[PDB]
Design a protein around this nucleic acid. Structure first.
Ligand SMILES: NCCCC#Cc1cn([C@H]2C[C@H](O)[C@@H](COP(=O)(O)OP(=O)(O)OP(=O)(O)O)O2)c2nc(N)[nH]c(=O)c12
Ligand SMILES: [Mg+2]
Ligand SMILES: [Mg+2]
Ligand SMILES: [Mg+2]
Ligand SMILES: [Mg+2]
Ligand SMILES: [Mg+2]
Length: 539
DNA sequence: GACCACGGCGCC
DNA sequence: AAACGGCGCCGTGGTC
């Protein structure tokens, strides 16, 4: 390309180099733009951002987030990554996309700008005739990137002093557990080492091995294996408790307070738009989509996620979303009727599991039922949920029978989905998002059947993902008008931050927007709560 | 110091 | 672990 002085014309494709991958923490090392056979290199990157009308090109959201960080209202526009991801969700990296669609991902901003221009031209051409994918791009993915950029730049407040105090307390309990484990082992060792633990349990203590690990075939020390050995030796329970505490402390309690941004005083994640095979988002650096909530200590950690002073968090959560989606996709009368009657499958299953009336089902019991309901739906074995429920194999067989027999058209939709998948080479969501599954025609059964479970799950999980994305795009401008903030997305949950005076109105509006985003054969119901912290806002 | 595979596990 | 699906991060063991 012909070198030309900054600034570039309108509609130019940007290229840029960051000191690190996280846009909220990155230094803008270089900035460039390409248009009309010319490349414009910015002598002064930060000031040059002001000359841009939009961030158009590869990883557009990243540059936009950095711009927002610097108080510049620069929205992301066209991004070849989004086009490639829609064509094939295995297109997740700019390295891969460049190689596949015409270029090479380098470390020079000018070459990145030129690459962005070429890739877009080529990828836009491949979207010719793909009207459903084109609809997803224009109406969902492209505007969503703008929404996500604002969310990333906003961040969420965290009670740092609380977590630091909690760390000291957990450390003392960990010390008690590890000391007991070493005593019971008869000698100290690296309890964090599963290799050393394996030898202690199975060679020294002579406990029976239950399972083997996948890649190397070692005797597994997983929680599922330990759960089976809970009554064989006192050391097992102590290890399980050590596992829980060290997991939470090393993953959340200790790292998170060190990740507070010095300018915003808040915690900033990244919402990756081209990272999953189903169309779901992912969250990273740090992952805020896996904040603990199951155990007491876990809930204690979730409490650290708080609203700004004078504000309140609003948590909105779709009700039984994939089951409702399944009802629409399959068209099963029995399942549709269940949601028309306003029933709760999770509660009903949980009542059966613990053998109690459905009014005696606590949140923890209902949570466990989700493993059973979705597990069985997506192909869990009779042997597994017999171990999950600690019931005889024969009973576990019977549950799987009645589950599918209650909803006959579900199995029909699955068989239809798999056959179409074999013929076309891909499955699709309700809106036409695709996932290629070539292993549907594998001659090895274990491989073929594994692919099948991936294949028929994708339209269900993906449709729910499409619906949430659409809801986010619609909801965002409404929130901006109300002075409320969209903070987090957790797959089928949104976390908002609103002024105390407007909290209830925001909750009501967001609920209605989410419920009426795209009507199905069954009503979409959304549970909403308001609180000073994340945990309180979901109760 | 970084990167890796692995086992393991937090969430949806 | 076991024929649930979808993610990212932890420490270990290991290389470079
Ligand atoms: N396994 C430990 C127990 C907690 C859990 C969970 C799961 C959730 N999902 C998918 C299906 C849900 O529709 C979607 C949202 O998760 P959710 O809100 O927790 O569950 P749901 O929306 O069905 O219940 P609720 O929101 O009405 O309480 O994520 C799952 N999908 C699969 N294949 N397996 C799962 O375990 C889960
Ligand atoms: Mg407060
Ligand atoms: Mg939900
Ligand atoms: Mg949820
Ligand atoms: Mg792994
Ligand atoms: Mg290992």
């Amino acid at each position: 390309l012909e070198e030309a002085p900054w600034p570039p014309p309108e509609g130019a494709f940007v290229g840029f180099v960051l000191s690190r991958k996280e846009p909220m923490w990155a230094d803008l090392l270089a900035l460039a733009a390409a248009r009309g056979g010319r490349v414009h290199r910015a002598p002064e990157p930060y000031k040059a951002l002001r000359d841009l009308k939009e961030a158009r090109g590869l990883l557009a959201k990243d540059l936009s987030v950095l711009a927002l960080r610097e108080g510049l209202g620069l929205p992301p526009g066209d991004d070849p990554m989004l086009l490639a991801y829609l064509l094939d969700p295995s297109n997740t990296t700019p390295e891969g996309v460049a190689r596949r669609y015409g270029g090479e991902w380098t470390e020079e901003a000018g070459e990145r700008a030129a690459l962005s221009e070429r890739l877009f031209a080529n990828l836009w051409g491949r979207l010719e005739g793909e009207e459903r994918l084109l609809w997803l791009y224009r109406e969902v993915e492209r505007p969503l990137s703008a929404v996500l950029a604002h969310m990333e730049a906003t961040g969420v407040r965290l009670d740092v002093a609380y977590l630091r105090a909690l760390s000291l307390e957990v450390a003392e309990e960990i010390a008690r557990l590890e000391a007991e484990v070493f005593r019971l082992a008869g000698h100290p060792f690296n309890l964090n080492s599963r290799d050393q633990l394996e030898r202690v349990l199975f060679d020294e203590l002579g406990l029976p091995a239950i399972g083997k690990t996948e890649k190397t075939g070692k005797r597994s020390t997983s929680a599922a294996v330990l759960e089976a050995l809970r009554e064989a030796h006192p050391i097992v329970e102590k290890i399980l408790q050590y596992r829980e505490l060290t997991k939470l402390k090393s993953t959340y309690i200790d790292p998170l307070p060190d990740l507070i941004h010095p300018r915003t005083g808040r915690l900033h994640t990244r919402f990756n738009q081209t990272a999953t095979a189903t169309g779901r988002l992912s969250s990273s650096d740090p992952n805020l989509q896996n904040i603990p909530v199951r155990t007491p200590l876990g809930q204690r950690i979730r409490r650290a996620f708080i609203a700004e002073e004078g504000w309140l968090l609003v948590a909105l959560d779709y009700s039984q979303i994939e089951l409702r989606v399944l009802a629409h996709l399959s068209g099963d009368e029995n399942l549709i009727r269940v949601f028309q009657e306003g029933r709760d499958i999770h509660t009903e299953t949980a009542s059966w599991m613990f053998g109690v009336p459905r009014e005696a089902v606590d949140p923890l019991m209902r949570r466990a039922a989700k493993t059973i309901n979705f597990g069985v739906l997506y192909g869990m074995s009779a042997h597994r949920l017999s171990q999950e429920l600690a019931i005889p194999y024969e009973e576990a067989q019977a549950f799987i029978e009645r589950y599918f027999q209650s909803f006959p058209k579900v199995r029909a939709w699955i068989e239809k989905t798999l056959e179409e998948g074999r013929r076309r080479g891909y499955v699709e969501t309700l809106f036409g998002r695709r996932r290629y599954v070539p292993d549907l025609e594998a001659r090895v059964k274990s491989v073929r059947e594994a692919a099948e479970r991936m294949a028929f799950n994708m339209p269900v999980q993906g449709t729910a993902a499409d619906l949430m994305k659409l809801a986010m795009v619609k909801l965002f401008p409404r929130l901006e008008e109300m002075g409320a903030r969209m903070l987090l997305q957790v797959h089928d949950e949104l976390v908002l931050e609103a002024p105390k005076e407007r909290a209830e109105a925001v909750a009501r509006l967001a609920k209605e927007v989410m419920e009426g985003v795209y009507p199905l054969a069954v009503p979409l119901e959304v549970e909403v709560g308001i609180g000073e912290d994340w945990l309180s806002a979901k109760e």
